[PDB]
Design a protein around this ligand. Structure first.
Ligand SMILES: *[C@@H]1O[C@H](CO)[C@@H](O)[C@H](O)[C@H]1NC(=O)CCCCCCC(C)C
Ligand SMILES: *[C@@H]1O[C@H](CO)[C@@H](O)[C@H](O)[C@H]1NC(C)=O
Ligand SMILES: *[C@H]1O[C@H](CO)[C@@H](O)[C@H](O)[C@@H]1O
Lengths: 7, 79
């Protein structure tokens, strides 16, 4: 991880 | 045309929209009637989680329809 979203 | 937004509280609210108004505009129209932040609304209709950037006509939502105002589910996809 280390980013975000949400998809 | 006119639509209805039934909520968890069970209180039906009469909204007055147009075929051109986007879903987000509808959500924001609720912020004018109640004060609920649009960024906290999730309109469900016909077992579908209506997208923000998309008009009513795209969903074929016809006159005198009833949507559901639930709370945005924090997704678990992502990180
Ligand atoms: C990310 O969202 C998940 C739910 O979808 C949570 O379970 C998870 O704990 C969240 N992790 C976070 O770090 C949330 C944001 C925390 C603040 C980030 C500030 C940035 C780095 C400037
Ligand atoms: C995360 O993305 C999903 C995509 O299905 C969405 O349903 C949910 O509202 C999002 N959660 C947020 C923006 O916190
Ligand atoms: C979720 O998955 C998509 C796949 O395209 C990535 O682009 C995104 O950054 C995240 O990993």
């Amino acid at each position: 991880x280390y980013x975000x979203x949400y998809x | 045309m006119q639509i209805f937004v039934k909520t968890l509280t069970g209180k039906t609210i009469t909204l007055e929209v147009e075929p051109s108004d986007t879903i987000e505009n509808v959500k924001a129209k609720i912020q004018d009637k109640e004060g609920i932040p649009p960024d906290q609304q999730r309109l469900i209709f016909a077992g579908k989680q209506l997208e923000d950037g998309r008009t009513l006509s795209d969903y074929n939502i016809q006159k005198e329809s009833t949507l559901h105002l639930v709370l945005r589910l924090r997704g678990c996809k992502x990180x």
